């Protein structure tokens, strides 16, 4: 299966460029999935979709 | 790169310079430049104030203006000893903005 976990971060975390993002999804048992990256350098208006990791 | 003279001296110089083939956009807001005459060595940082985006739909470089709010001054004549300007000469999807000029292939 696959499957994507959706969260709004608009104003819980502020995502500006070139901050540092880390963290985990903590199961029930068994191990984390570990979430770990940096935002770009630059964005640019014509790229609003952005692969981070 | 360019160079306006009068009297007995070059007094502005104009860099043009653009990415290499390949490249990630680079944001200019966070370069430095660094140039010596073997007497003394500037070093000088972006200033935010001294930008023009229109001329990327031509003009006259060396007589290009900028905008302290109320108003429209010469930008060469203005821009302090510590400091760069830049000016937008091509850019095809509006990439530079005055707060963030990351330039990108072209
Ligand atoms: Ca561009």
Redesign the interface.
Known sequence: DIVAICLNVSNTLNLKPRTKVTGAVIPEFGAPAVISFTTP??Y???QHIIELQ | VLGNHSGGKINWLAVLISPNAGS??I?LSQATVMITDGTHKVIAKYNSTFFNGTLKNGGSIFEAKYNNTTALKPLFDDLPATAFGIVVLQDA???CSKD?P?I?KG
Request: aromatic residues 0%.
């Open positions: 350098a630059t640019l208006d014509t | 990630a956009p944001d999807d509006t990439s963030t990351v990108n």
